[PDB]
């Protein structure tokens, strides 16, 4: 998850939920089913 230094080039899709990008259309839906399952990382003890 990174944007403004990556990729000169802002993609016209992007997420809401975490603020990803995907010049495309299929792949940022496909990604939209990352979240739904939660996995473990973050501040989450452990
Ligand atoms: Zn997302």
Redesign the pocket.
């Known amino acids: 998850?990174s944007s403004g230094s990556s990729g000169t080039g802002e993609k016209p899709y992007k997420?809401?939920?975490?603020?990803?990008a995907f010049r495309v259309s299929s792949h940022?839906v496909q990604?939209?089913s990352?979240?739904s399952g939660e996995r473990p990382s973050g501040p989450s003890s452990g």
Do not use: A, T
């Open positions: 998850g997420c809401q939920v975490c603020g990803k940022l990604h939209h990352v979240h």
